[PDB]
């Protein structure tokens, strides 16, 4: 991509996966150096982040919480979209939240923890935003069984 | 610091939500929005259903304007398969999408003016649903979006009622425009709230009326060349007064801009119902495609990772108003219990696309 | 396989008492006055057709009820306990609606939660369907003669402490 | 093109599916441990779902589940 | 309104098949059902707006057929009948008859209404309380057209 | 908030200070309210049997944290026990309420 | 002169209340329309009309359905390709009337009508049969309480 060989090429792991369908680009980024990577992509021209996507390919294996960060603004209209690909596993749900710098990620990271269980830090209130706080298990991951609850059947 | 419960049956009618605040005195200072009330699990079932089976499912998101949801979820596979839509059906789709934007903003300002009446807007709404009945046949539960365009054709009465809608509707709109200049209770009861600027609304997450409230001419369909938007008359609201009445002028200008687009598209007519229909059943591909459209609340989005099967492998929706719900924790700091009604009105949100 | 009622007699068999019962039942079948209970896709019929959650006994459930909605819903029925019943006006208050198979956080009808007299076709019908539904309900209450004021409490309880582990 | 057929009984042990959440409710209990789930689709992975319980299906590995028999159970 | 006479009770104990011609003007229909219920009888409800093959539904143990949502099998079980189980739903002996309250005169087929009225003549404890296509007044015409 | 229960038909957890029918305030006393809607017969000896069975189930199923998931599990298999008790004829129906929907299906001729 | 400014604010307020009162007095003149109880086009998608002998094979109503609700048992008869269809059981509590198989039927015996009066007293009554789904609902012109509904026109002002 553009920023992977210009800005993140100075000692950052911008492991590209090719181009996406229309104009986006997927670049694999590890879970240790992510908040500094988020601040580096923040001070680039890119400001507007939306649609944090937590897809669950390979159930029991790799888990990802990708982004759709672009650089839209008020007067200029240079929409350069990119997917910051962060990855994790079932054994390691530890991922850093961007809620210390990008505070508006409360609902996004809470839904990601609420539907997958991705363990987070630097987050003010990480709670189950759709399920009860007593609820165990996560429905969005493909290796999940909804247990014997009578409200899930008609009978 | 008496904790408000903020129960399910609100004194207003704008959905079911939870906004527990410590409220030291009458000043609200700390917001904890609890959600999950109107929840369906759209993503996992959409992974378990096809496009023709989750295509009846796109009605429970922004049901005050149901054309936007099915429009973006059919424009997904059209640009995914690279199947060309003819100009006639695409322009009629533009007309009905702007009419649904009209319906969304008037069905916002109806109950908003009821909280802060119903037949002052229902005189228009009966002819609006007559247009929906002459367009597709349902009131708001239409299923008429195909890959080639509209599933049916326009009848010979709907084009005449569409010609009559302009001088049926714009006159009562401009009779409703002068009320905020006349009536000072809107100059004193909703005036003031909405203190975010442009460099901050770009900074957090905002889009739609909260981004155009600061005087930014923002538009997805102007930046992205989509449905020939530069042919029609456009005036995106660069109103920089910031507050809630600035948002009301934003919504009046968006309705009037859609009126200008439809009025220029009354006599356009540049072309069949569905192009590329050999077979009733098809599949989808596997690409990295995020499609978005200009929502009335700001950048509704569909994320798609394909499976090359009958089911999509990943189906995540970015709703506009749920990203727009993030800013109230910051727009709660120095207001009142008599102000949060105006706040949850000026967010312009229903809980269909929130929990989903 | 059912139970057996008592069915001894009708003690209030004078003309004045049955006249007052018929007039009070027809006036009870005349004054619906729902607390609305919208906040869903069935709220749209309210604009075409109070706030004290213990007042209006003749509420119809015109909303999509979920599992998290269910404790407040049974508490609200505890706030309308003895006199009148509810009317299911949604496929999701009847069978779970369109998500009757695979939805985890949505109850398959309030027919496992609350006594329901009338079941609707469900998804927003015409605004005269609710009028026909309350007319039917008026015909139902007109059949009722206030059960001749015949009363029983179960009161099942254990006073042994549970093996608790709070936070 | 796949591992097994579609419609065989799925028996589940608590140790055999230890990647999932089968050890949180220690004791309540569950129901899909016996020959209750049926294979509805397959891909490495296979879709499962009970023959009488109408709940949402899942995806599980071809060795994590087990084709048990052809014995449906209802009423 | 409120004409004080129990002549509808005399019609239901003499003919036992009367079309209740009464509007949608509130609940002015169940008062005679309440007088039948206060006489010691038991009244249950039915509607002909979705009741097909009515003699095959009131008797002969019409099938249950539970609607599976793409998960369960067909399970073609036989549910108990409508009015035979309702005659089985009278646990004391003081219940003199069973009233079958029908509230759908449209979509009814004149032949099948005569078949259902003959089925009210089949059991002696069965009372037909069908509708009368919503006249303006309260008229209790018998099953003459059916 | 303060209500912590999984309340359905014939099973209501209601962990509150409820000796009599007056609700309160909230404690570890789980007051199992059964049959709010008058749906079945519910003879007193059979109610004592079902209450003793529920006591044995909450005694053997505890030891873990008594949060809401254990409440869903215990109300669910309590409803399974009530269904298998009424299917064997220990619990007949009522036919004294204004619905009598036959919530567990009509008993067959088998 | 702050109370003078309060008085000027209330002068503008009284002007606005008078103008809005004229607007609402004109809004109270909505006499001809008055939608209420009776005391549309063909695509109402209300009650679904069904035909039994035209229903033959392909079971597409159970497949394209968002919940797969239809329950039809069938046993193959030899050498004549007849499935021996029985018990077309549709639960309208399960049914959404979202209309997929109404237009997606190969036989096209599934058609919609204008009936919506299916508010019933019990959920087990909603399990309808194939003969109950073949009933012509109503000719709405032929009522003594229903006039002509303003379908093509609007604000007719002809009843009075
Ligand atoms: S059945 Fe559908 S339309 Fe009706 S309340 Fe439920 S979700 Fe809304
Ligand atoms: S009615 Fe439709 S689904 Fe049924 S057998 Fe005929 S073609 Fe197949
Ligand atoms: S009427 Fe609608 S919900 Fe019912 S089977 Fe047809 S498409 Fe499915």
Helix (H) or strand (E) holding A73: none
From C37, C39, C42, C106, the mutation candidate for ligand 1 (largest count of ligand atoms within 8 A of CB) is C42
From F106's Cα to the closest Cα of chain E, the distance in A is: 6
Under a CB-based contact definition with an 8 Å cutoff, are residues G8 and G73 in contact? no
From residue F78, give the alpha-carbon distance in Å to each of A54, C96, F68, F75. Answer: 37, 22, 15, 5
From G93, G94, G96, G133, the mutation candidate for ligand 3 (largest count of ligand atoms within 8 A of CB) is G96
Phi first, then psi: give them for residue C25, nearest 5 degrees: -75, -40
Rounded Cα distance, C119 and C86, in Å: 10
CA–CA–CA angle G46, G48, G51 (5° rounding): 160
DSSP secondary structure, B103-127, as one string: HHHHHHHHHHHHH---HHHHHHHHH
Rounded Cα distance, G104 and G112, in Å: 13
Rounded Cα distance, B326 and B347, in Å: 10
In chain A, the N- to C-terminal Cα span, in Å, equals 55
Residues in chain G: 160
Which residue in B148, B151, B131 sits closest to B140, CA to CA?
B131
Which residue in E49, E113, C124 sits closest to G138, CA to CA?
E49
Interacting residues of B215 by C-beta distance below 8 A, sequence separation 6+: B198, B238, B239, B240, B241
Under a CB-based contact definition with an 8 Å cutoff, are residues A88 and A112 in contact? no
User: Which residues of C make up each annotated binding site for [4Fe-4S] cluster?
Assistant: 41-42, 92, 123
Q: Which residue of G has its CA nearest to E51?
A: G132
Which residue in B302, B262, B330 sits closest to B78, CA to CA?
B302
CA–CA–CA angle G91, G92, G93 (5° rounding): 90
Task: Give the Å distance between the CA of A11 and the centre of ligand 1.
Answer: 54
Per DSSP bridges, beta strands B18-21 and C116-119 are: unpaired
Q: Does G55 contact ligand 3 (Cβ within 6 A)?
A: no
3-state secondary structure of C119: strand
Residue B40 is nearest to which of C39, C43, C103, comparing CB atoms?
A: C103
User: Which residues of C make up each annotated binding site?
Assistant: 41-42, 92, 123
Under a CB-based contact definition with an 8 Å cutoff, are residues G87 and E63 in contact? yes
Rounded Cα distance, G73 and G87, in Å: 7
Rounded Cα distance, A151 and A135, in Å: 15
Rounded Cα distance, A7 and A18, in Å: 17
Rounded Cα distance, F79 and F40, in Å: 13
Q: How many CB atoms lie under 10 A from the CB of residue E106? A: 15
DSSP state, E78? B
Interacting residues of A99 by C-beta distance below 8 A, sequence separation 6+: A105, A106, A109, A120, A122, A123, A124
Under a CB-based contact definition with an 8 Å cutoff, are residues A62 and A141 in contact? no
From residue B220, give the alpha-carbon distance in Å to each of B288, B316, C104, E126. Answer: 20, 20, 36, 69
| Chain D interface includes F69 (CB < 8 A) | yes
DSSP state, C126? -
Rounded Cα distance, A14 and C137, in Å: 67
Under a CB-based contact definition with an 8 Å cutoff, are residues E21 and E103 in contact? no
From residue A14, give the alpha-carbon distance in Å to each of A1, A21, A65, A93, E58. Answer: 9, 19, 16, 21, 73
Phi first, then psi: give them for residue B340, nearest 5 degrees: -70, -25
Q: Does C41 contact ligand 1 (Cβ within 6 A)?
A: yes
Contact: F103, C112; criterion CB under 8 Å: yes
Q: Beta partners for B214?
A: none
Task: Give the Å distance between the CA of C27 and the centre of ligand 3.
Answer: 40
Under a CB-based contact definition with an 8 Å cutoff, are residues B252 and B235 in contact? no
Rounded Cα distance, D71 and D48, in Å: 15
Instruction: Tell me the Cα Rg of chain G.
Output: 27
Nearest C-alpha to atom 5 of ligand 2 is from which residue? G57
Interacting residues of B82 by C-beta distance below 8 A, sequence separation 6+: none
Rounded Cα distance, C108 and C117, in Å: 17
| Chain E interface includes F105 (CB < 8 A) | yes
Under a CB-based contact definition with an 8 Å cutoff, are residues A40 and A8 in contact? yes
Helix axes F68-87, F44-60, angle to 10 degrees: 140
Task: Give the Å distance between the CA of G62 and the centre of ligand 3.
Answer: 9
3-state secondary structure of B258: helix
Per DSSP bridges, beta strands A120-121 and A95-96 are: parallel
From residue G72, give the alpha-carbon distance in Å to each of E29, E51, F87, G61. Answer: 37, 17, 26, 10
Where are the alpha helices (H) located in chain B, listed in sequence order? 42-48, 51-54, 66-81, 87-115, 119-135, 158-177, 179-182, 198-201, 209-212, 220-223, 244-264, 320-324, 340-346
- What's the per-residue H, E or C state across chain G? CHHHHHHHHHHHHHHHHHHHHHHHHHHCCCCCCCCCCCCCCCCCCCCEECCCCCCCCCCCCCCCCCCCCCEEECCCECCCCECCCEEEEEECCCCCCCCCCCCCCCCCCCEECCCCCCCECCCHHHEECCCHHHCCCCCHHHCCCCCCCCCCCCCCCCCC
| Chain E residues within 8 A of G89 when measuring between CB atoms | 63, 65, 67
Rounded Cα distance, E100 and E98, in Å: 6
| Chain E interface includes G142 (CB < 8 A) | no
Q: Beta partners for A155?
A: none
Q: Which residue of F has its CA nearest to A135?
A: F69
| Chain B residues within 8 A of D56 when measuring between CB atoms | 44-45, 48
DSSP secondary structure, A126-145, as one string: ---SSS-TT--S-SSSTT--
Interacting residues of B67 by C-beta distance below 8 A, sequence separation 6+: B96, B97, B99, B100, B142
Per DSSP bridges, beta strands D45-50 and D58-61 are: antiparallel
Residue D72 is nearest to which of E68, E69, E73, comparing CB atoms?
A: E73
| Chain A residues within 8 A of F104 when measuring between CB atoms | 155
Rounded Cα distance, A77 and B144, in Å: 33
Instruction: Tell me the Cα Rg of chain E.
Output: 17
Under a CB-based contact definition with an 8 Å cutoff, are residues G92 and E50 in contact? yes
Interacting residues of B44 by C-beta distance below 8 A, sequence separation 6+: A139, A140, C102, D56
Rounded Cα distance, G89 and G71, in Å: 6
Rounded Cα distance, A114 and A132, in Å: 10
Q: In what order do the strands lie in the sheet with D37-42?
A: D9-10, D37-42, D45-50, D58-61
Q: Beta partners for A87?
A: A64
**How far is Cα of residue B293 from the mean position of the Cα atoms in its chain?**
10
| Chain D interface includes A147 (CB < 8 A) | yes
With an 8 Å Cβ cutoff, the interface of chain G facing chain B consists of 9, 12-13, 15-17, 19-20, 23-24, 27, 30, 33, 35, 40-45, 64-66, 96, 98-100, 104, 152, 154
Which residue in B53, B247, B272 sits closest to B152, CA to CA?
B272
Rounded Cα distance, A40 and A24, in Å: 19
CA–CA–CA angle B195, B200, B204 (5° rounding): 115
Under a CB-based contact definition with an 8 Å cutoff, are residues B97 and B68 in contact? yes
Q: Which atom of ligand 1 is nearest to the CA of C91?
A: 1
| Chain E residues within 8 A of D53 when measuring between CB atoms | 71
| Chain C residues within 8 A of E31 when measuring between CB atoms | 22, 25-26, 142
Residues in chain E: 146
Rounded Cα distance, B288 and B290, in Å: 7
Interacting residues of B347 by C-beta distance below 8 A, sequence separation 6+: B210, B321, B324, B325, B328
Q: Beta partners for A48?
A: A70
Rounded Cα distance, F104 and F83, in Å: 7
Under a CB-based contact definition with an 8 Å cutoff, are residues E108 and E47 in contact? no
Mutate to test the interface with D, among A145, A146, A150, A151 (most CBs of D within 10 A): A145
Under a CB-based contact definition with an 8 Å cutoff, are residues C119 and C140 in contact? no
Under a CB-based contact definition with an 8 Å cutoff, are residues E69 and B45 in contact? no
Phi first, then psi: give them for residue A63, nearest 5 degrees: -130, 135
Which residue in G72, G64, G122 sits closest to G92, CA to CA?
G122
CA–CA–CA angle E103, E105, C60 (5° rounding): 35
Resolution (A): 3.9
Rounded Cα distance, F62 and F81, in Å: 18
How many contacts, defined by CB atoms under 8 Å, are there between C and D?
11
Cα dihedral G97, G98, G103, G104 sign: negative
Q: How many CB atoms lie under 10 A from the CB of residue E118? A: 14
3-state secondary structure of B149: coil
DSSP secondary structure, B32-56, as one string: EEE--SS---HHHHHHHS-HHHHTT
Interacting residues of E83 by C-beta distance below 8 A, sequence separation 6+: E58, E59, E98, E100, E119, E123, E126
Q: Does C34 contact ligand 1 (Cβ within 6 A)?
A: no
How many contacts, defined by CB atoms under 8 Å, are there between D and F?
19
From C118's Cα to the closest Cα of chain F, the distance in A is: 9
Question: What stretches of chain E adopt beta strand conformation (E)?
Answer: 42-46, 98-102, 126-129
Helix (H) or strand (E) holding A15: strand A15-19
Interacting residues of D7 by C-beta distance below 8 A, sequence separation 6+: D38, D39, D40, D70
Q: Does G133 contact ligand 2 (Cβ within 6 A)?
A: no
Per DSSP bridges, beta strands C116-119 and B300-305 are: unpaired
Which residue in B302, B283, B149 sits closest to A21, CA to CA?
B302
Rounded Cα distance, B210 and B102, in Å: 18
Interacting residues of A85 by C-beta distance below 8 A, sequence separation 6+: A15, A17, A26, A27, A28, A29, A64, A66
Q: Which atom of ligand 3 is nearest to the CA of G102?
A: 6
From residue C21, give the alpha-carbon distance in Å to each of C134, C146, E44. Answer: 20, 8, 21
Interacting residues of D6 by C-beta distance below 8 A, sequence separation 6+: D39, D40, D41, D42
Q: How many CB atoms lie under 10 A from the CB of residue A9? A: 10
Q: Which residue of C has its CA nearest to A139?
A: C104
Rounded Cα distance, B348 and B112, in Å: 9
Rounded Cα distance, C152 and F98, in Å: 16
Rounded Cα distance, A44 and E117, in Å: 83
**How far is Cα of residue B325 from the mean position of the Cα atoms in its chain?**
14
Phi first, then psi: give them for residue D67, nearest 5 degrees: -70, 110
Contact: C122, G92; criterion CB under 8 Å: yes
3-state secondary structure of B184: coil
Under a CB-based contact definition with an 8 Å cutoff, are residues A46 and A101 in contact? no
| Chain D residues within 8 A of F63 when measuring between CB atoms | 26-27
3-state secondary structure of B15: coil
Helix (H) or strand (E) holding A16: strand A15-19
Q: What is the dihedral of CA D23, D29, D31, D35, to 10 degrees?
A: 70
**HSE of F2 in the Cβ direction (CA atoms, 13 Å)?**
10
3-state secondary structure of E12: helix
Cα dihedral A93, A98, A99, A104 sign: negative
Contact: F33, C156; criterion CB under 8 Å: yes
Q: Within the 25-54 window of chain G, which residues sit less than 8 Å (CB to CB) from chain F?
A: none
From residue B283, give the alpha-carbon distance in Å to each of A57, B42, B308, B309, D42. Answer: 20, 20, 7, 6, 18
Residue F92 is nearest to which of C3, C116, C166, comparing CB atoms?
A: C3
Interacting residues of C150 by C-beta distance below 8 A, sequence separation 6+: C6
DSSP secondary structure, C9-27, as one string: --S--SHHHHHHHHHHHHH
With 0-12 CB in 10 A as exposed, 13-18 as middle and 19+ as buried, what is G36? exposed
In chain F, the N- to C-terminal Cα span, in Å, equals 48
From C152's Cα to the closest Cα of chain B, the distance in A is: 32
Residue E107 is nearest to which of G70, G125, G135, comparing CB atoms?
A: G135
| Chain D interface includes C101 (CB < 8 A) | yes
Rounded Cα distance, E25 and A151, in Å: 38
Interacting residues of C1 by C-beta distance below 8 A, sequence separation 6+: F89, F92, F93, F107
Which residue in B70, B41, B322 sits closest to A50, CA to CA?
B322
Phi first, then psi: give them for residue B4, nearest 5 degrees: -80, 140
| Chain F residues within 8 A of C75 when measuring between CB atoms | 3
DSSP state, B204? T
Rounded Cα distance, C69 and B7, in Å: 11
Under a CB-based contact definition with an 8 Å cutoff, are residues G49 and G113 in contact? yes
Q: Does C42 contact ligand 1 (Cβ within 6 A)?
A: yes
Under a CB-based contact definition with an 8 Å cutoff, are residues E125 and E87 in contact? yes
From E5's Cα to the closest Cα of chain C, the distance in A is: 11
Contact: A155, C70; criterion CB under 8 Å: no
Q: Which atom of ligand 2 is nearest to the CA of G56?
A: 5
From residue B225, give the alpha-carbon distance in Å to each of B220, B229, G126. Answer: 8, 7, 51
Which residue in A142, B306, A55 sits closest to D47, CA to CA?
A142
Residue B48 is nearest to which of C36, C47, C102, comparing CB atoms?
A: C102
């Amino acid at each position: 991509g553009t920023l992977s060989v210009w800005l993140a090429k100075r000692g950052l792991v911008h492991r590209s996966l090719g181009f996406d369908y229309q104009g986006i680009e997927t670049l694999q980024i590890k879970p240790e150096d992510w908040h500094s990577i988020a601040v580096i992509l923040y001070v680039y021209g890119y400001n507007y982040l939306r649609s944090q996507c937590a897809y669950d390919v390979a159930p029991g294996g790799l888990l990802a919480s990708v982004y759709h960060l672009t650089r839209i603004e008020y007067g200029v209209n240079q929409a350069e979209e990119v997917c910051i690909k962060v990855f994790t596993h079932r054994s390691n749900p530890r991922i850093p939240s961007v809620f210390w710098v990008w505070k508006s990620t409360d609902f996004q990271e809470r839904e990601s923890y609420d539907m997958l269980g991705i363990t987070y830090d630097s987050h003010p209130r990480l709670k189950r935003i759709l399920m009860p706080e007593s609820w165990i298990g996560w429905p969005l991951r493909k290796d999940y069984i909804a247990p014997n609850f009578y409200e899930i059947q008609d009978a | 610091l008496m904790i408000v419960n903020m129960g399910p049956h609100h004194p207003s009618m704008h959905g079911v939500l939870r906004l527990i605040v410590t409220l030291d005195g009458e000043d609200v200072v700390d917001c904890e929005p609890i959600l999950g009330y109107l929840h369906r699990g759209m993503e996992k079932i959409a992974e378990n259903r096809a496009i023709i089976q989750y295509l009846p499912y796109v009605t429970r998101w922004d049901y005050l304007a149901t054309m936007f949801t099915e429009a973006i979820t059919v424009n997904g596979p059209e640009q995914l398969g690279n199947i060309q839509v003819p100009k006639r059906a695409s322009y009629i789709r533009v007309i009905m999408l702007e009419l649904s934007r009209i319906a969304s903003h008037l069905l916002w300002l109806g109950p908003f003016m009821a909280d802060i009446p119903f037949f002052y807007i229902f005189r228009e709404r009966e002819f609006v649903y007559d247009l929906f009945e002459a367009a597709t046949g349902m009131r708001m539960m239409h299923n008429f979006f195909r890959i080639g365009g509209i599933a049916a054709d326009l009848p010979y009465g709907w084009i005449d009622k569409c010609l009559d809608f302009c001088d049926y509707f714009l006159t009562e709109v401009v009779e409703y425009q002068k009320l905020i200049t006349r009536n000072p209770i809107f100059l004193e009861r909703v005036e003031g709230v909405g203190i975010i600027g442009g460099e901050e609304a770009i900074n957090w997450g905002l889009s739609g009326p909260m981004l155009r409230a600061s005087g930014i001419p923002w538009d997805l369909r102007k930046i992205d060349r989509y449905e020939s938007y530069d042919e029609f008359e456009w005036e995106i609201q660069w109103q920089k007064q910031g507050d809630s009445l600035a948002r009301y002028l934003v919504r009046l200008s968006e309705m009037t801009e859609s009126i200008k687009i439809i009025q220029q598209a009354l006599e356009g007519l540049p072309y069949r119902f569905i192009s590329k229909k050999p077979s009733p059943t098809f599949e989808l591909s596997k690409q990295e495609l995020y499609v978005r459209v200009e929502a009335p609340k700001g950048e509704l989005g569909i994320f798609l990772i394909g499976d090359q099967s009958g089911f999509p492998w990943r189906w995540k929706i970015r709703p506009p108003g749920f990203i727009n719900l993030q800013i109230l924790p910051e727009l709660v700091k120095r207001m009142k219990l008599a102000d949060i009604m105006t706040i949850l009105g000026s967010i312009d949100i229903i809980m269909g696309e929130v929990d989903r | 396989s059912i139970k057996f009622p008592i069915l001894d007699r009708t003690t209030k068999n004078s003309v004045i008492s049955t006249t007052l019962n018929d007039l009070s039942n027809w006036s009870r079948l005349s004054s619906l006055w729902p607390l609305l209970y919208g906040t869903s896709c069935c709220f749209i019929e309210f604009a075409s057709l109070r706030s004290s959650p213990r007042q209006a006994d003749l509420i119809l459930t015109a909303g999509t009820v979920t599992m998290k909605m269910a404790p407040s819903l049974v508490r609200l029925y505890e706030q309308m306990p003895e006199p009148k019943y509810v009317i299911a006006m949604g496929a999701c208050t009847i069978t779970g609606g369109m998500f009757s198979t695979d939805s985890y956080s949505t109850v398959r009808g309030v027919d496992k939660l609350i006594p329901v007299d009338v079941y609707l076709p469900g998804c927003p019908p015409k605004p005269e369907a609710v009028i026909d539904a309350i007319t039917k309900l008026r015909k139902k209450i007109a059949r009722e003669i206030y059960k001749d004021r015949i009363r029983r409490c179960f009161t099942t309880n254990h006073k042994f402490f549970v093996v608790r582990s709070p936070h | 093109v796949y591992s097994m057929k579609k419609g065989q009984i799925v028996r589940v042990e608590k140790e055999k599916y230890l990647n999932s959440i089968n050890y949180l409710s220690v004791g309540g209990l569950d129901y899909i441990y016996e020959d209750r789930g049926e294979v509805l689709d397959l891909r490495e992975y296979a879709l499962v779902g009970w023959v009488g319980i109408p709940t949402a299906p899942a995806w599980l590995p071809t060795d994590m589940l087990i084709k048990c028999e052809k014995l449906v159970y209802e009423r | 309104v409120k004409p004080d006479i129990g002549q509808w009770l005399q019609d239901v104990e003499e003919h036992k098949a009367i079309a209740i011609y009464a509007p949608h003007e509130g609940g002015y229909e169940g008062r005679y059902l309440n007088r039948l219920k206060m006489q010691g009888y038991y009244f249950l409800d039915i509607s002909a707006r979705g009741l097909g093959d009515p003699e095959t539904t009131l008797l002969k143990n019409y099938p249950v057929c539970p609607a599976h949502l793409g998960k369960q099998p067909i399970a073609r079980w036989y549910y108990p009948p409508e009015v035979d189980y309702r005659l089985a739903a009278l646990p004391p002996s003081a219940k003199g008859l069973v009233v079958w309250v029908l509230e759908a005169k449209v979509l009814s087929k004149s032949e099948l209404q005569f078949l259902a009225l003959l089925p009210s003549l089949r059991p002696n404890v069965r009372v037909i309380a069908e509708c009368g296509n919503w006249r303006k007044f309260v008229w209790k015409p018998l099953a003459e057209i059916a | 908030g303060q209500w912590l229960s999984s309340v359905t038909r014939h099973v209501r957890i209601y962990a509150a200070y409820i000796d009599p029918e007056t609700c309160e305030s909230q404690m570890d006393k789980l007051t199992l309210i059964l049959d709010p809607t008058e749906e079945f017969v519910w003879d007193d000896e059979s109610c004592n049997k079902v209450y003793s069975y529920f006591q044995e189930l909450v005694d053997h199923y505890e030891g873990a944290p008594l949060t809401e998931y254990t409440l869903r599990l215990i109300g669910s298999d309590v409803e399974h026990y009530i269904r298998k008790m009424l299917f064997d004829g220990e619990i007949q129906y009522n036919m004294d309420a204004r619905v009598l929907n036959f919530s567990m299906g009509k008993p067959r001729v088998q | 002169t702050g109370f003078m400014n309060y008085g000027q604010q209330t002068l503008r307020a009284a002007r606005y209340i008078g103008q809005g009162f004229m607007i609402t007095l004109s809004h109270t003149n909505r006499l001809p329309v008055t939608i209420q109880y009776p005391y549309t086009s063909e695509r109402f998608r209300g009650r679904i009309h069904f035909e039994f002998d035209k229903c033959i094979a392909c079971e597409v109503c159970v497949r394209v359905c968002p919940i797969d609700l239809p329950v039809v048992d069938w046993k193959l008869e030899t050498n004549i390709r007849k499935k021996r269809l029985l018990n077309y059981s549709i639960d309208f509590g399960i049914c959404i009337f979202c209309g997929n198989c109404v237009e997606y039927c190969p036989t096209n015996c599934l058609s919609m009508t204008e009936e919506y009066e299916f508010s019933t007293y019990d959920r087990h009554e909603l399990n309808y049969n194939q003969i109950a789904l073949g009933r012509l609902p109503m000719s709405v012109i032929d009522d003594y309480t229903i006039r002509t509904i303003w379908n093509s026109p609007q604000t007719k002002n002809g009843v009075n």
